[PDB]
Design a protein around this nucleic acid. Sequence first.
DNA 1: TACTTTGATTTTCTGCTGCAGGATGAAATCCCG
DNA 2: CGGGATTTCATCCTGCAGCATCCCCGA
RNA 3: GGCGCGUUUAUUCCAUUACUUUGGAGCCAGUCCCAGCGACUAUGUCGUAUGGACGAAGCGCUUAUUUAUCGGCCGAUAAGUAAAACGCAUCAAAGUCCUGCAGCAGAAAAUCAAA
Length: 960
Amino acid sequence: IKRINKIRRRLVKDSNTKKAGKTGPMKTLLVRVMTPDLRERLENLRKKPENIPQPISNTSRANLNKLLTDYTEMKKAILHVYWEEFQKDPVGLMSRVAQPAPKNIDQRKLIPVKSSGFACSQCCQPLYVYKLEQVNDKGKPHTNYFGRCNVSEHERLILLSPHKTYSLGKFGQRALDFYSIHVTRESNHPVKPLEQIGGNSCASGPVGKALSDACMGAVASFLTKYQDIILEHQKVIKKNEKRLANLKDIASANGLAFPKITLPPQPHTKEGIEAYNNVVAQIVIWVNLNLWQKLKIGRDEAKPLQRLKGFPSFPLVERQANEVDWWDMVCNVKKLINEKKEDGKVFWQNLAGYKRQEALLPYLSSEEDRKKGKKFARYQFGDLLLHLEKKHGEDWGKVYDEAWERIDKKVEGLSKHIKLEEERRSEDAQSKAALTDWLRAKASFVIEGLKEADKDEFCRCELKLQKWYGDLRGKPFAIEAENSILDISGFSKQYNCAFIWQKDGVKKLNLYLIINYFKGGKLRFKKIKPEAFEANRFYTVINKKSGEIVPMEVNFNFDDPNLIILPLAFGKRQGREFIWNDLLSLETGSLKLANGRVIEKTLYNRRTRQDEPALFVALTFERREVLDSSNIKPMNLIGIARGENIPAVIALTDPEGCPLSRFKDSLGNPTHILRIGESYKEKQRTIQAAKEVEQRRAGGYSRKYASKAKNLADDMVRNTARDLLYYAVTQDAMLIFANLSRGFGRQGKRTFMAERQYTRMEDWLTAKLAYEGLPSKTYLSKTLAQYTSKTCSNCGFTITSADYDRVLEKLKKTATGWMTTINGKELKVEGQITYYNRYKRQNVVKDLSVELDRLSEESVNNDISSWTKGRSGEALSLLKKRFSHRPVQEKFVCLNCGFETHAAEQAALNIARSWLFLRSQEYKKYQTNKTTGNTDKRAFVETWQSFYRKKLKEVWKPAV
DNA sequence: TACTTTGATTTTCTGCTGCAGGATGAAATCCCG
DNA sequence: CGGGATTTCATCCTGCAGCATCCCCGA
RNA sequence: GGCGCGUUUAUUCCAUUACUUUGGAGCCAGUCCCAGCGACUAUGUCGUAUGGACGAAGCGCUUAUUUAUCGGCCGAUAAGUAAAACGCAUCAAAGUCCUGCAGCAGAAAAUCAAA
């Protein structure tokens, strides 16, 4: 039976247990706080439970709300202070936040710099460089670099990273002493969040220590991203200089006038980035308008400049609160439309004959628009104008007035309907979208007469109307809520937080979470004997740094007006995982509670169809006892192929490489191929289609679809990981993946991020293995991905570009038509090719022989070598498309022997066979020969094909 | 021969992945009943 | 004088190996 | 699309704790009232269920007052109400979180240009 927990139990029973290292694996339990609505849900059951729990009391709710608001305000204040500090002096701050080396690395410094890369801003003295050479565990020598000062107060060892000229290398959350600056009463800093925001009501210790981490973590992350990106920006600047020079030369060679603008130096703020990107945009606009379009020059010969991307913003303080009132903007648009009425009337009425047809060309819909069931407001207004012209003749003076009156009446009706709708309870997004579209159409109609008179005022009007159109269409779907976070630094007597339980029976437990963050509250811990439990008394466990577990009795008062008491809501599965686990018991110390958080975030309520705030509790657990991996030795192989249409296709093989038919398909016949994840893409496309329909109708989709794709993707990833682990454990096999880079995936036009699940599957399988204490190499391995999907599994021949080039070279004409040979096999050049005509938006079918004859109609003796570049290019494009090894995505055809099969299954088998290849002796001789500087892929392909053919002859008997 | 696609830039809103920072207890003073 | 409450401090171990592989192919 | 009942995901032993999701099965989808869109006899008419508003959303099992049939519900058959309690439709899986940025993609609109 395929259960993840069953596989975990089998893994546990098969090996010994050992204590974890300094830090073990971590896992988070996310539960909900028992609120009145959950109780109401519990009271509507057909079979009512015997004991319905009490919800969170009113006093706790008030305390929690106040504390959450105060915590958010203190975070904002501290972040604003450090934003000002960074904006004043970057280098000083990022030198202050750099993490010092441990005060234990006191090996003998050997060599100073052969100097002043940075400076300790505390004393404004340079940090001199000092090296230290050592050997790693793998034998590769490594030199670390450190910065030291002659100040005794600043006699530290700040880590450094060399570049080809030094960087810092690490930013810590605790390097800067936050408590002594902002929390302690002796400090003279003008900003003291606990003393000012909270009104001296919160305990200094816990709240201050939580703020320390919460703010300095974000600051350190921003500093790391900034220092990282400031180097690739330099590389891009240097690269753009050469391209600008080359394009200037090309423009000069063709006798064109290049704009006289200069690229600014490398910027270090957001305004400089915007200026540089504006210059790049102007250059690219000119290049496209004059070089690619008019002269038909290839993009490769005239390469564009590149924008600067990835510059971070300061945390939480640079957010733009684009808060605009909707009806006010509607009124402003109406006002400015009413301003220009006379100018539009004058332009339209006094217009000439033939200029009128071109004046209203953008107002006339196309045939495709008329066919697709619905038209934009512009074309509808154009149809109205045409009918009015037919009605009144050529007297456009009356036409203008009638059109204006009709548009006003329609807009007034829409406005009245929208106001009545929003008065009661309801939102009609379609009506708002229609009103915005009709306002846009009226604005265009009025202002189109100023496109040639005053381009500055016309540009101002266009900018205003464009920004207001964007804002009006985007506001009704703008989210205004944000999560609220309350942190718990740790679970020890210091931080005044407890996770308490009554000992019902011997194993049964009651459950509360207690927070004491207000002055005056009482929460007392008392040490007791290990087995001195009593009824109606709350107990907990305290974990000591030395490995000791101290059971304590926690006593307090329920009616205390300062405490926060939270009852939790969870399921059997979560309880067996964390609270009352059979093996990982937290009373024994095998499981430890690390820290926690109280979260307020939005849940979707379908009863009211709205997002509403809700309270969650997250508790992080650390595993202290893990397994021993020294005895696991898989024997067989499972090659796994990843993709989009099918998330996983797996093939099972013996140690020799021969297929093993042990899986059962739907029909029950033995097989060696399994598919995991089918019909996932179809569901994702269905969700996307629903989203697109709503987006076209109203400009955005409802909150019902907010998290559907992510939930589906998470479900697929977790279930696929379970399936892979189950097969690997039960078949005694090692899993083999392709060596795809992190973040690998297609970045095209109709691509979606929910369909890029390669690294996610990798990470989930690795983490699931890691929680038990085993390394990734125990059950998972990677191999080179080259030529795995391009090798025939029946003959061992791999197709390459050079083969296609040589086939083009040999192709000629006999009395029967075009002919060629590959590896002594004759090819009868015939058959039709159908291509997806994008301009026609259809499928166009052509005949290869006829196309080849046409290409030979302008040529004599059919000499391919005598053709131009473009003609030969079309020739090999046609031959490649007709002789492609992958005519259809899921179908593979071998060109050398005519073998046909499924591409994914063959590639899955070839992945395992390649993993076998990498540890053969042919690869050894190839590696030895490659040391002579011969960097040729051709020899690698030779070795791969030779090994594959040898093994096919020897032991891999092909299917007959 | 031409209508209809495509190239570039700008405005607004949403979601999903990717990568940084993390997953604090021990000990020393100080004050107050 | 003991017990809360507040303040100060400090911790770390990892690769390597070749241009393709869910891209495809295009008026 | 909407409305509800809820099972299985630990072998004696572990909170039918109640959470958040992915599946299976049950029941119900009309009205131009207001808008949107399309065709025109065109400052309106007609049509169209695109969006709001209204309306729809299991079946049995046992208990006692009234009527219809005999001596005038006591004995049974149908109709009308709240509750107690069980059964069938009807069933399998998964969960490692927080903060902060960035990058891609989706959807419209505006302008210039080419073929």
